[PDB]
Amino acid sequence: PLIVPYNLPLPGGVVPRMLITILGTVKPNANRIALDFQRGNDVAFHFNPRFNENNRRVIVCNTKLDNNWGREERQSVFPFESGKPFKIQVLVEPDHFKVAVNDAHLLQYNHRVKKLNEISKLGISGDIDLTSASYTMI
Numbered sequence: 001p002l003i004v005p006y007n008l009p010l011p012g013g014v015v016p017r018m019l020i021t022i023l024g025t026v027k028p029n030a031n032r033i034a035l036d037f038q039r040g041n042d043v044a045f046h047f048n049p050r051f052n053e054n055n056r057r058v059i060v061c062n063t064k065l066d067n068n069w070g071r072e073e074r075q076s077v078f079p080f081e082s083g084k085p086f087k088i089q090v091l092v093e094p095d096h097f098k099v100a101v102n103d104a105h106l107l108q109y110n111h112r113v114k115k116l117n118e119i120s121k122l123g124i125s126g127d128i129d130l131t132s133a134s135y136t137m138i
């Protein structure tokens, strides 16, 4: 496997038609997963499944600028399950990140950080065994 937290460099940043594919398995009794698309210290797109927030499962998405979190976008559709293998696909489209899990569309996140080619790293963290993380141009 890959060691978590795992960094995936995105050479030259992201660009529309770039597809990121993450395969892993959720640990037993998981609490959280996070994807952090970084522009230096800023987080352009934070994607954060939470398995127990006040006894609810929710995906929280946000942007961090100068160490400040912005407005959360929350999604109560929650395709992850403790103990089970998953696939996350993040497709960069011109105006949003488009996320599908296990081949089903999940959410979109409008670009707040505009300098896409400066979003040069993806951090993958949380309560998972990470099997693979890669990108391709489609």
Ligand SMILES: OC[C@H]1O[C@@H](O[C@H]2[C@H](O)[C@@H](O)[C@H](O)O[C@@H]2CO)[C@H](O)[C@@H](O)[C@H]1O
Binding pocket: 046, 048, 060, 061, 062, 069, 070, 072
């Ligand atoms: O917004 C993403 C960001 O959330 C932090 O937790 C928030 C929490 O979601 C919010 O309900 C509460 O009022 O403030 C917390 C701190 O901003 C996480 O700590 C952080 O990791 C991100 O997930």
